[PDB]
Amino acid sequence: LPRPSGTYAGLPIADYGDAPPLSTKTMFWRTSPEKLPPGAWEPAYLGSKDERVDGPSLQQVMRDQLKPYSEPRGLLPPQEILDAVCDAIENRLENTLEPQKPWTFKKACESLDKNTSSGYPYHKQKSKDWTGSAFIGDLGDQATHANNMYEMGKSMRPIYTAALKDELVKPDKIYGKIKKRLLWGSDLGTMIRAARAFGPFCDALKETCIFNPIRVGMSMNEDGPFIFARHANFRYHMDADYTRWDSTQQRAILKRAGDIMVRLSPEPDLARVVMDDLLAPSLLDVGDYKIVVEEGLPSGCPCTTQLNSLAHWILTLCAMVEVTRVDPDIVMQESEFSFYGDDEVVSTNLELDMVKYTMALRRYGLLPTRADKEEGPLERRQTLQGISFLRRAIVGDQFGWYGRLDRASIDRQLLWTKGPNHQNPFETLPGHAQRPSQLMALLGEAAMHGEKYYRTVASRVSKEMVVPRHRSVLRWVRFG
Amino acid sequence: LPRPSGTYAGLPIADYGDAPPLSTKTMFWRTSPEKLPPGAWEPAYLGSKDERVDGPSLQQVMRDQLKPYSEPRGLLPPQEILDAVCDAIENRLENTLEPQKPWTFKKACESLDKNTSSGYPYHKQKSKDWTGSAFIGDLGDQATHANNMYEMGKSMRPIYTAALKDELVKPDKIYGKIKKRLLWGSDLGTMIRAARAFGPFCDALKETCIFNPIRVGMSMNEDGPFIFARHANFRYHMDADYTRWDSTQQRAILKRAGDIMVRLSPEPDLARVVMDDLLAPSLLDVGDYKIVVEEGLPSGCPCTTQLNSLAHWILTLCAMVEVTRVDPDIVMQESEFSFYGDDEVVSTNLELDMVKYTMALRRYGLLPTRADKEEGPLERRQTLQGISFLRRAIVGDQFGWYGRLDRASIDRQLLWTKGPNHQNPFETLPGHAQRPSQLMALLGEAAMHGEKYYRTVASRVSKEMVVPRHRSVLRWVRFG
Ligand SMILES: NC(=O)c1ncn([C@@H]2O[C@H](CO)[C@@H](O)[C@H]2O)n1
Ligand SMILES: NC(=O)c1ncn([C@@H]2O[C@H](CO)[C@@H](O)[C@H]2O)n1
Ligand SMILES: [Mg+2]
Ligand SMILES: [Mg+2]
């Protein structure tokens, strides 16, 4: 790790790799031996061992995912606008966030998801070194060292591990041009430091997820109705529907978001050291090599999705301010935003030139796309109905607004179920005894589509009855 | 109690009275010996012993309050409209209310406010016969008999006790034309029966107070923002601001509201017996006599304020349906209502002829009044801002909507404090050690008016410090 030399997928090699091989397995199993409807989604490509198609290696698929990181960046928004929007944003957070006490090492440790990997360098499930209150063994060593560096304000180089997302995808991403989504896996030391540094801010932010636009932490079922009611106070509604959000980010933008997180943290000088590490040119371990990724979002650790949401807030406000020429905090008097990483809903009373708005977005290097996928510009509508958020269509009736999962995704979840990793997606789980709460929730989702549809998906079990009456589950899913 | 003969205050005497004399005391004490600002509110008239003015007897003041009950009633809304709106209303409640289990005698008993009177015939504070889990002694006898009548579906005649409200009033109601507000005090037996009958429905209703328009049970601070956000989804806003709501009610309207409560109750046949008793010509004990009050609202027991809110819903929908000619449930797709007894906010997208709307209201015998108190018709506005609800002005900024208590009422609460009953309102409590949470809440209210105003009312103590910074209490009062 002196200085880089060599190139992989268009990016500089900084070191030999330590990551385990990409997974060739999926967690999805068919729920029935029957034949899939034509055009059905299926688990993403499993690589050379994947019986369904002869395709490239997982590594080559990953190589494709890394291309956008060497694309030239877009332009910075005009400096004066950028400063004004960041100030307005930080100021809104000062007026809303409840000041927090610092997180302990112990709190940082309990916060981590114990079911995912520790990443570099042990790449073991976190629970495997977890007593219930602390990390011991290898993980305990790594945790404790990182924590000492944190308290001394000393810098550590994060090391991320590249992976590919096991998820259902439309058949074309398997039988046409193979595509599978890139994942950044943080290292345990970095997760510890980020958690201690930023946990307080993130908790304060979540408590605020209804009246601030960063919606991370919200309950669709509990908060959706209030949040959507808010959006509906405004005349115009839209969704830029971005392509490649994370890989098109500018670190310079991310650093402005980071500055805000730092200043709003209980231990700002300790949190600066950590943020500077997160945002410095990143080491990504693709297996054979660790490569240097200077640009785009390094999406590994616990609080990046808030960092990303914050960057999104900054950009959206920048574009709106540039076009309408109204002050960032005045725009926020006339608008309601929802952000969750790249996911967005923007509602405003302001009269926005959509051609200019799209061009500004594209100029910052973002890739917004129209619903109909035709050559731009973005459209705006005068009804919230039809826009979506967190994968749920936004619906309004006489009782209020709410998020509804579309019939296709409901159908899909009836066709697949989660289980241990395996090679052949079309295998049926022999367990024939799953889906406790899952099923119930699916009844909930379906009830919201009317009795006709609900009666069909009440099909059914098992392989314990019986079907709750439609009225009853509809009432239960919408109301207290 | 055979049949009526004789007249008191224009109403028929049915029996000799048993009520204690009207109170000559107030619970309010000055917080300081200083002289009141001119025009300051003061506790209502205390009768012949009231040092501040030579005025009539409390009884004569009450006699005046009873006049509206012998006024001829207004017209019933056209039958076809009345049926349609009631059906739409009952139907909305069916789709929203979570079905309930019957209340036990024990549950009915614990629900009662133990700090108020038992009314007829013991007129003792309820706590005085209360073990912590059951009524013993006299109250136990009365409770247990009423409860047996309830379970056998047997009818009892309610007996209400007239009182006059001890509250702060504008000086003119003390030094000009004396006025003091009539109160109906239910009898313990009736409270038991109404509670067992209607408690389930009322609890189911309260759980629903955000997405149904009967707002009884709401928290201004917690629910206000969501509720007001809902209202703000609509274009037009208004408030009929009624005079003498309760005394202008038609029992026939109240019975339609009652029918709905009955059918939506877990023990409908038992609840019918009770509702028929509540709504039958009522015995009101004014001291010397029990008089028969056939019309207006008998506002005694636990659930009348929901009954009254429901009647209000019926009337408002009737007037809107009559004028706009759109179906009651379609009106409820295009509107948001809030009702709390006579207190109302009506928001709609519908294009309402306000002349026709006022005339329809007046025809049902209601007395809506304009903000400026000039000869009608009611106005509508296009902003919610400026309308009030539950005595709090409705305010909206970039964070959302919320209820704010006006500076005058805040000032007032600094000038008076609650204490034991006494004769001279200008006496200062010698206790000089009160107002724990009270003060804090007052800081909250004042913070919402800006730092300038907030700094002044931070005056202050005591007679423990210190003043929380304005930012801090503003944040605490608006947000989580
Ligand atoms: N489309 C969505 O709802 C979503 N979820 C997460 N992210 C953001 O994208 C990153 C990687 O997917 C995360 O860390 C978040 O910042 N976006
Ligand atoms: N103005 C208000 O907010 C209010 N509060 C209560 N009521 C109704 O009026 C009756 C007597 O005041 C109660 O039982 C309720 O039905 N109105
Ligand atoms: Mg969206
Ligand atoms: Mg009002």
Curated annotation (Swiss-Prot), chains A, B:
Transmembrane intervals: none
Outcome after substituting residue 241 to A: Almost complete loss of RNA-directed RNA polymerase
Cofactor(s) the protein needs: Mg(2+); Mn(2+)
Record comment: activity regulation: Inhibited by Suramin, Suramin-related compounds and NF023. Inhibited by PPNDS.
Superkingdom of the source species: Viruses
Known outcome of mutating residue 342 to A: Almost complete loss of RNA-directed RNA polymerase
Catalytic activity: RNA(n) + a ribonucleoside 5'-triphosphate = RNA(n+1) + diphosphate
Location in the cell: Host cytoplasm, Host perinuclear region
Domain RdRp catalytic: 235-356
Disulfide-bond pairs as recorded: 301-303
Amino-acid positions noted as binding Mg(2+) in the UniProt annotation, renumbered to this chain: 239, 241, 343-344, 388
Subunit structure: Homohexamer; also forms fibrous hexameric oligomer. Interacts with the viral genome-linked protein; this interaction induces the multimerization of the RdRp and enhances its activity.
Role noted for this protein: Replicates genomic and antigenomic RNA by recognizing replications specific signals. Also transcribes a subgenomic mRNA by initiating RNA synthesis internally on antigenomic RNA. This sgRNA codes for structural proteins. Catalyzes the covalent attachment VPg with viral RNAs.
Protein name (Swiss-Prot/TrEMBL): RNA-directed RNA polymerase
Organism: Norovirus (isolate Mouse/NoV/United States/MNV1/2002/GV)
Residue span relative to the full protein: 1182 to 1668 of 1687
